[PDB]
Amino acid sequence: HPDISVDVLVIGAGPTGLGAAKRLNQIDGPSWMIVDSNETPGGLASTDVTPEGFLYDVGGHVIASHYKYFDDCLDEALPKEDDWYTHQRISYVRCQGQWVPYPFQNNISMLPKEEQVKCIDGMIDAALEARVANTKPKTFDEWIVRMMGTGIADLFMRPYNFKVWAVPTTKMQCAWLGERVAAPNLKAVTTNVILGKTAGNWGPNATFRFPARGGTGGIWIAVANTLPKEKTRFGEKGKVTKVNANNKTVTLQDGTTIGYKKLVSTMAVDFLAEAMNDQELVGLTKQLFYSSTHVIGVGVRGSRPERIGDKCWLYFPEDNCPFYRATIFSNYSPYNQPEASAALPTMQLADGSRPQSTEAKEGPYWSIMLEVSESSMKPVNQETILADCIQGLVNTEMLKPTDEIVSTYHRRFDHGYPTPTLEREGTLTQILPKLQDKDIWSRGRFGSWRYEVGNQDHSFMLGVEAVDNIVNGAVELTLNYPDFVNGRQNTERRLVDGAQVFAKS
Amino acid sequence: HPDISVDVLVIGAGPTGLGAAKRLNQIDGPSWMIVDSNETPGGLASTDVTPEGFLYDVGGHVIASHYKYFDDCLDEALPKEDDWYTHQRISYVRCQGQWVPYPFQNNISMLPKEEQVKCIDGMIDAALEARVANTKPKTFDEWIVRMMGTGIADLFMRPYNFKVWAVPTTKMQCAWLGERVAAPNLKAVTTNVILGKTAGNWGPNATFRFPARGGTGGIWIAVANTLPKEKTRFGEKGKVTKVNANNKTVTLQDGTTIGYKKLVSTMAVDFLAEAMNDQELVGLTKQLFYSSTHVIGVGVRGSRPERIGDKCWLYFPEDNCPFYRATIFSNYSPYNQPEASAALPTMQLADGSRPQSTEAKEGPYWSIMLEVSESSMKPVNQETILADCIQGLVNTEMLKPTDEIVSTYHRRFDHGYPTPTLEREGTLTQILPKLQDKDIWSRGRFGSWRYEVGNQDHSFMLGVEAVDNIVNGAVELTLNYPDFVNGRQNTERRLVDGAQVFAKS
Amino acid sequence: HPDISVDVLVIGAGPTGLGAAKRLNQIDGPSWMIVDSNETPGGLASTDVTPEGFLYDVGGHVIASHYKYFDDCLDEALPKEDDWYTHQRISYVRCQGQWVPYPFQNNISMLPKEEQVKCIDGMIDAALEARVANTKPKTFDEWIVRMMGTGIADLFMRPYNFKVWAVPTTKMQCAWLGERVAAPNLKAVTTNVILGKTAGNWGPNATFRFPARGGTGGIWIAVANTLPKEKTRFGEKGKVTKVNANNKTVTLQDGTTIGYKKLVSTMAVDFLAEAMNDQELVGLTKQLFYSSTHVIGVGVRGSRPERIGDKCWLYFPEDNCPFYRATIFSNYSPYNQPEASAALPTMQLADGSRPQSTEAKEGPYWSIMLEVSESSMKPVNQETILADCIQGLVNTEMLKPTDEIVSTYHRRFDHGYPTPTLEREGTLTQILPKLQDKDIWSRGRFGSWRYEVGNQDHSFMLGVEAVDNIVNGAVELTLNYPDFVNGRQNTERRLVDGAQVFAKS
Amino acid sequence: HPDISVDVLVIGAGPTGLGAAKRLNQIDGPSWMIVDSNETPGGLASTDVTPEGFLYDVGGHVIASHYKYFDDCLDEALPKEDDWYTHQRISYVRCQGQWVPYPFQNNISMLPKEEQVKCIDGMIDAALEARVANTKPKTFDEWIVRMMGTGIADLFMRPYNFKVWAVPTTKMQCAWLGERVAAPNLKAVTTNVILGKTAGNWGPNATFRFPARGGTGGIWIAVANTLPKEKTRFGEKGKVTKVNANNKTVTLQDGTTIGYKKLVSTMAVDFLAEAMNDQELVGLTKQLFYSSTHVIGVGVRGSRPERIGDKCWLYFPEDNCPFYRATIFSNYSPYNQPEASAALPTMQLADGSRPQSTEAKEGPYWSIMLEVSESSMKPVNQETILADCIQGLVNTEMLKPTDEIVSTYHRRFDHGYPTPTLEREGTLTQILPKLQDKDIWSRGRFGSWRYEVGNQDHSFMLGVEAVDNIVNGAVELTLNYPDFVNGRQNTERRLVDGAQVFAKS
Ligand SMILES: O=c1ccn([C@@H]2O[C@H](COP(=O)(O)OP(=O)(O)O)[C@@H](O)[C@H]2O)c(=O)[nH]1
């Protein structure tokens, strides 16, 4: 007999596991337990802090919720109005010396006229082809070209997406982008060119809210804290090392065994196959593709430069920098970096030279957070990536050679993006149903490997819905129908449902 | 305080209300109660019997389930292998002296050659127009022409649908018809013409099971029997006369008041509006449209004629009979009509004449069930419709003039079909949310008026999901996304969920 | 027996008739003569002079020759280099205060940005519809929209063409416009909008030669002068009053009868019908439509204004002036108006006021020639049209209010344009073969009534080809195939053919 | 100075040369003469006779005139109604044991059903593609597929045209086929399949007339005979061996020199170039491509078999016979073969056996004329081609193994078809203008090398129009605009024109 027995064991306390846990706690029916190898819940939605006091998320993390239930849990966890800051969704594409507002194609008037001609011509071709199309695109590349035409494709989405995914766009499927027909809005694009006009897709009603304190990680610490502590096991004492699917027994690193009736595994499915010592599943999961994510963080002295301004996140298609995305993380909260009166020595100048003095000087400070992808098709030199990022900051005019860097951060995350390759679905549909037959709900960004439902709210709800499937026979909508959940307001499920109301009576 | 108080009240014990009751009974959380003005549950899925022992459903009722939950409750209600008879769909369309296999449009290959030309020419125009189409059809008619061409439109689709919906095809929308109306492949249809082949396997009901006893009504009586009797109130004692939405109080005919927290109403929503004395809702519901259904039953002496054979239901686009559909009801179960040893006198010959003898004679007997639609746009002479149907049977060679009729049946059902008019949705999106704000779940064939989810299983699940929404924050999928639930096997929700399994240990 | 007998009789000594006579005179086989009711040959290709010495053509006449034969005869008629002046086409469209380079539809780049958007959007619409179009436009208007979109239609093509054709675009066919109306390339038009470029090279008249003396009329006087005088009868003595198609006899106003074997008639065919006293033909010819042309000439004191420059002819779609076209006739030849030392009093100022004195002041002088159309759908007030035109010149900033007008000219030409109405071809194919079967070749601008072969070179060659058909069995290519003659260089026929070369040996 | 001087010299007395001469003789202005290496005029439109008395044209020659002038000359040559026989244009395609009426696609109901499916499916694809087509086909093969679809193309036009042109369909251009858009008549093809109907494109309207005597060759002997004898030089005495273009002299076999002012050459342009000792033109003309034609004639004993019947010419796509076309030449005139009373011995039976007697026996007789193509891409074994053709007649069931063959015929014509290769036009637009610059009108089937104007009427008119161009400045319509002359009634030019009517009075 196992050391512990529960009805539903949840492996992992990132967003997905915490989702499963929150729903179990609410339902308060079957017995349950959540574990994690980390003392701090949050997984890829965690936050680090440099010794100099600069916070960094695991790359740019911006919440766009598709679910009321998700909002309920964030509100419960961080209920105060000053637990959060609201910002407009401001983003730009760096192209040929210019900060081009997103979406890129509505703003090509910033480019030289010759290129505008090239762009419009390509989109005219794409429009005339769309008018007679009778097939769906089969690759990410085809989808891009049908949406944008060759000129606009070549300038942004093609080179940018290689830098993001670390695989060519021709090797990825496009179904994950949704059911929208791949066709250009030629009139919109041509109008802005003729008018010599720019327009970003943000404004007063296009916002996000970001945690006042502790970065994105502050959310999941708060959410996790609403759980009954005795049902949680976080840290080395909670690391799963073996999974016996036949006995429905899990073994922890310290030797503790847990019996379960249903298992919700939110660890990377390739690691689950290993933990299971399931040779067949190992072979299958190894056919999945992913990229690793390098997060580089740079702490800068001085008030926010005019050239940066209210920019939130930024895209880099060009090859004069290794990062695909930059975030002005200091714009997300005042508390993502030290206060102005905090004294810190200058480590280096942005051109790499030494400071004139090693004295600690006061702020104020601002902060840039960078992402660089890696795969077998796109290697990254760990010894030089920081320096190359900083040079990239100079090249893209985010920093001047004279800017004073006071803090640096670099961490590599092995499983960063699950890749929507052409082969993904053919693989997943062999893996996930075999786990299912063993009463294992493998769910999450790397639990079920689907990027289009791979954000915080999706992950959280994957865990919620998996529990709802286990207990109430609910349809796992987020898992099997990303277009469905992404295209509606999901308002039905709440942190307080009829079931808990009628019961209190 | 009212006479009785329940958390959830269900009005109506047709399939929809019984679905609500079954889910409420399974969950066993909130207190509940189901009422019906009729002593016998079943509603439009009930069965009458003539004094001579011939059973008739409310027209042809063939079960094609989209849900494992529905299957679970039917199996529970009628568990024995001999509770059911299994049949293949044998369906034909009467067209110019011939029986054309359903679907008509995929069986062109059986008509006169000169008519095959008209049909194939039409489909060729349609195919070429469809090749450059960039707009969706807006009316049922436009749909029909775009996917079939004029030839087939004029020959079958248009006259038949007027005949069954009792409004012209130009007055109906077309978002409802995914699993109802087969759109023909030009190549497939042409290929069958060339080869002289047929193709009768389109759609959901290629095999169905029919209750051995008591007609379709036997199911819902049996399902109702699994409910705790003290939580049911069927008959004059359970007739709802007043609804006070504001006090959340329902008043029954005998003056019994019932207080509720949540209301699931499965009566026709226009009658609900009347019962609420809500003159705003009355005006809105009167913008809906419906047809009435006349059901005519004819009991015939003799062994099943060769010309009839294993035919199940039959379509009649032409003008030589008033009915749009005939069901060989005696093919569905041997217990739908008297055994051969039953002695019955001949009431009339099929040509209308009086029988040679008034002596009771033995069988065997077979049985035809006919449907005739009526609306403000398609009036019916009530007084002559029985005779007109019988003559229609002679006209279409279903009966010989000398066939001996031993039993007749005619009953008018005022609300038969909720019509997918062009105005339907605009009206419903006013009505259903307004009731929703008053904590009223109006659901069902006429409860929510959507024919594309108007079958027994849909209705049942509308009830199940309304409860699942009220208690568990479930999405009402069947209600809001007909194409979604009709396009998948809905396996997740079971008559025994994890909730009950875990609780019982 | 009649007074005179010839093999071929030519009626009319405009370009078409002179064409006939030239070819007859070249061939020098069959006997022939040419008559005209006018003493001066030339027809609508003649030139008037005001008493103050200002020449005016019958509206803007610019030669654009498709035929070597025509070139041969003009060179023979006017062999000296200084018999001619060469000019580039400098043509513009007046639109919202600006001069837009011809053709309008290819110079969108010149309009305000907001008009530019409207125009391009319309062209984008048309481009997309044209990609799947499988029918030809039936009317001029349909053609316009289909090839240019609504924006350009409304802004220029529709008002301009009503103003010149004196019927709406919806009343005209569109098979005539190959070499008259440029079809805009979406890419080219958009590219020039983006770059801010112009495109003024479209068409056949990018370079023209104009006679140094006597206006366009100087050409036909000279051409007629190369004919043998005794074969001509120009003046009252050559006015045709009766045509007896049966006896093949023509009666002149002075009573002269001329018998013919073949008749080439170049007078308006409706005039021919009346002179034939052929009532059926009169009927048919009244089914044709034509507009009248008002020519207004304005002689102005001053050296050529800078705002005028090298402009040749100008289009006016707007309703701030009565005329559809202005020609800077003084730019065509220095001898179209008096020399600078010619003394002339000011008749009026352009603002309409009388001048201070009757003092004759010297030049130099420049000259504007205006055209205003009239039809039963577009009346012209003849008593005011001159003043309206002059006010028009002020409204369009052609003349300053203070400009000094020293000569004025107004003349109405009843048959100005043969309208390409919808009915035109149906009517002509009843008229011309009937005249053909009576050995009458009816040809020319109003002889055969086809504007697309309605220019001086066309007209001339219609006469030439008629003679060639009569004598040498040649195909009447210009008559029956406008697109064929207009799309090629017609170099084969010469004023000296092999026939004459060999005969002189 | 030369032995003879003329204004216009014509080399060749095939149809093209005779056309030139007929028009020269009609105009009767410039001096002229016509020469030919052959004593008998006619060229490839001549006729041979075997020693047994069977006539053979140079392959199937069927007149379809596009010109009145041609008809005038034929009718002048053979004016009696019994100089000609009239027949319906009856042709079939041999395909899988069947004689399929032409055109093939309207008669595929004779094929197996499974193949009808494949054909119709292919043509449906073609129809759908044609609806969105925005390009012209570039090759003959592309044109075939767009016209017929894949399945129909593979059965007839693709393998048949390889057998005709002796080059792949992918190596030929398709402009020569005319201006008709390459698109299926899907309804016409489908309608005949549905009706099970066959219908060839002949009837009372669709006829040809064939010479009663002397075969096609008789026409040209008769036309030549209307020429004044002393202006002709036919035989060894008229064989051109040298052309000196710079000196405008031709030298004949017997050493006679002829001076000309204009030269109409109708010999093959590659021999013209050789004769000109113009190495540049030699090199250019060698880049043209042509196939050689083998003609095989088989005289058969017996009355016409029922299986042959009224057939005229037959196409053979399949590879069980070497010939691409067969003609039932005995059906064209009863004088193409001996009378019934003529006695001939059997040479062999169709299976190759010896007859059971060498005695002469009487007729009647019938006759088959076959065509086999040869090129460098498709060799022909001259020594076995007769026997292979005869074996082909048995394989195609045209002859039974027992049929008695009483005459055989085989002749190879080196220049047989001028090939419309992709390269033809690029080559010809270099050859013809250089010859033109030297006053050489190279015209005819191999004179100007264009098959689409390569028939007897076309050829004749190339000579006629050449002369007309030389003398009267006419446009050479047939040379330059094949679509134009093939698409209209060319009725203007007559054998008696006004010129001769007027001069004779
Ligand atoms: O051969 C046929 C018979 C019926 N229908 C369509 O199918 C729909 C549903 O008819 P059915 O008998 O399936 O359903 P019911 O009326 O019983 O609910 C009708 O409205 C018809 O338009 C069709 O397209 N082809």
What is the CB-side half-sphere exposure of residue A336 using CA atoms within 13 A?
Answer: 28
Name, in order, each residue with C-beta under 8 angstroms of D426's C-beta and a sequence gap of 6 or more: none
**Dihedral through CA A76, CA A82, CA A83, CA A87, nearest 10?**
110
- The β-bridge partners of D211 are D84
Taking the C-alpha atoms of residue C441 and residue C433, their distance in angstroms, rounded to an integer, is 9
Single-letter code of the amino acid located at A286:
K
Interface test with D, best of C492, C495, C496 (most D CBs within 10 A): C492
Strands A404-418 and A348-349: antiparallel
Which residue in the set C114, C121, C187 is minimally distant from A124, CB to CB? C187
DSSP strand pairing (D290-301 vs D365-374): antiparallel
Q: How far is C185 from chain A (nearest CA, A)?
A: 12
Reported resolution, Å: 2.2
Residue B139 dihedral angles phi and psi, to the nearest 5°: -110, 160
Nearest Cα to Cα of residue C322 among C262, C430, C398: C398
In what helix (H) or strand (E) does residue D270 lie, and over which residues does it extend?
helix D269-275
How far, in Å, CA of C178 to CA of C485, rounded? 11
> Looking at residue A207, what DSSP letter applies?
E
Neighbours of A427 (CB within 10 A): 17
Q: Choose one of B63, B91, B164, B295 to mutate for the ligand 1 pocket test, by most ligand atoms within 8 angstroms of C-beta.
A: B164
DSSP code for B229: G
C-alpha–C-alpha distance, residues D190 and D194, integer Å: 6
Question: How close does chain D come to C233, measured CA to CA in Å?
Answer: 23
Experimental approach was X-ray
Residue D324 vs residues A285, D48, D166, D371: alpha-carbon distances, Å: 62, 21, 10, 6
Nearest ligand 1 atom to alpha carbon B181? 24
Atom of ligand 1 nearest to the CA of B325: 12
CA A129-A131-A134 angle, 5° bins: 80
For C34, list phi and psi in degrees, rounded to 5: -120, 135
Query: CA distances (Å), B330 to each of A304, B152, B313, in order?
Result: 85, 32, 11
Distance CA C372, CA C368 (A): 13
Look up residue A172 and give its amino acid. Answer: M
Chain C residues in contact with A124 by the CB 8 A cut-off are: 127, 186-187, 190
Task: Enumerate the residues of chain D whose CB falls inside 8 A of the CB of residue C437.
Answer: none
D120 CB neighbours in chain B (<8 A) are 190-191, 194
Is A315 labeled as ligand-binding?
yes
For residue A468, list chain B residues with Cβ-Cβ distance below 8 A.
472
Ligand 1 — pocket residues by CB below 6 A?
B 93, 102-105, 161, 164, 180-182, 315
Q: Any bridge partners for residue B94, and if so which? A: B99
Residue reference for tokens 């200084």: C82
- C411 pairs with which residues across the strands? C295
- Residues of B annotated in the binding site for NADPH, as ranges? 66, 89, 91, 102, 201, 313, 315, 417, 445, 455, 458
Q: DSSP H helical segments within A234-335, as ranges?
A: 269-275, 279-285
Beta bridge partners of A327: A313, A369
Residue type at D259 in one-letter notation: G
A and C: number of Cβ contacts within 8 A: 49
Interface contact flag, D474 C493, Cβ < 8 Å: yes
* Tokens standing for residue D361: 């026996």
At CB < 8 Å, which residues of chain A contact B? Answer: 7, 29-31, 69, 131-132, 134, 261-262, 468-477, 481, 484, 490, 492-494, 497-499, 502-503, 505
Q: Are strands A257-259 and A249-252 parallel, antiparallel or unpaired?
A: antiparallel
Question: β-strands D257-259, D84-88: how paired?
Answer: unpaired
Q: Give the Cα separation of A452 and A462 in Å (integer).
A: 12
Q: How many CB pairs below 8 A link C and D?
A: 79
Q: In B212-346, at which residue ranges do the beta strands (DSSP E only) sit?
A: 232-234, 240-244, 249-252, 257-265, 290-301, 313-315, 325-327, 344-345
What are the distances in angstroms from CA A277 to CA A240, A273, A417? 13, 6, 24
Beta strands in D218-261 (DSSP E): 232-234, 240-244, 249-252, 257-259
* Distance from residue C495's CA to the centre of ligand 1 (Å): 79
Q: Which of D402, D300, D410, D304 is nearest to D356 (CA)?
A: D402
Eight-state DSSP code of residue B184? P
Please report, for chain C, the start and end positions of each structural domain, with discontinuous segments joined by +: 7-505
D499–C472: do the CB atoms touch at under 8 Å?
A: yes
**B142 Rama class: left (phi>0) / alpha (psi -120 to 50) / beta:** alpha
- Collapsing DSSP to helix, strand or coil, A221 comes out as helix
Residues 6+ apart with CB under 8 A from B50: B56, B297, B299, B407, B408, B409
Residue A340 near residue A365 (C-beta atoms within 8 A): yes
- Phi and psi at residue D146, in whole multiples of 5°? -65, -30
Say if CB C60 and CB C265 are below 8 A apart.
no
Closest CA to A163 of A294, A302, A338: A294
Chain A contact partners (≥3 CB pairs within 8 A): B, C
How far is the C-alpha of D255 from the C-alpha of D277, rounded, in Å?
A: 17
**Which tokens is C52 given?**
């103050």
Q: How far apart are the first and last CA of chain A?
A: 39
Q: How many angstroms separate the CA atoms of B470 and D499, rounded?
A: 103
Binding-site residue positions of C for UDP-alpha-D-galactose: 59-60, 102, 105, 157, 160-161, 165, 180, 205, 315, 325, 417, 451, 455
**B203: helix, strand or coil:** coil
Could you tell me if A210 and A5 are in contact, meaning their C-beta atoms sit under 8 angstroms apart?
no
CA gap D279, D271 in Å, rounded: 12
Nearest CA, atom 6, ligand 1: B181
Q: Is the dihedral of CA C263, C268, C274, C279 positive or negative?
A: positive
Radius of gyration of chain D (CA): 24
Are D194 and B117 an interchain contact pair (Cβ–Cβ within 8 Å)? yes
State the nearest Cα–Cα gap between D147 and chain C, in angstroms.
17
The helix or strand, by DSSP H or E, that contains position A439, with its residue range, turns out to be none
Chain D nearest-CA residue for C504: D30
| CB-based burial label for A215 (10 Å; 0-12, 13-18, 19+) | buried
Q: Which CATH topology does A7-505 take? A: FAD/NAD(P)-binding domain (3.50.50)
- What is the DSSP annotation of B320-350? TSS-SEEE-GGGT-GGGS--TT--EE--EET
Q: Given an 8 Å threshold on Cβ–Cβ distance, is A117 in contact with C186?
A: no
The single-letter DSSP state of residue C310 is T
* Beta strands, E only, C37-165: 47-49, 55-57, 84-88, 91-95, 98-101
- DSSP 8-state class, residue A415: E
B88 near B101, Cβ under 8 Å?
Answer: no
Are the C-beta atoms of residues D33 and D5 closer than 8 Å to each other?
no
H-assigned helices in D43-131: 68-77, 113-131
Burial string for D225-248 (b: 16+ CB within 10 Å, else e) reads eebeeeebbbeeebbbeebebeeb
User: For ligand 1, atom 25, which residue shows the shortest CA distance?
Assistant: B103
Q: How many residues in total does chain D contain?
A: 505
* Cα distance between residue A21 and residue A35, in whole Å: 10
Neighbours of A287 (CB within 10 A): 15
Is the CB of residue C499 less than 8 Å from the CB of residue D467? Answer: no
Residue in D475, D481, D485, D505 to test binding to C, most C beta-carbons within 10 Å: D475
The angle that helices D215-224 and D68-77 make with each other, rounded to 10 degrees, is 90
Q: Is B114 left (phi over 0), alpha (psi -120 to 50) or beta?
A: alpha
* Cα–Cα distance for residue pair C499/D17, rounded to 1 Å: 20
Rounded CA separation D64/D47 (Å):
18
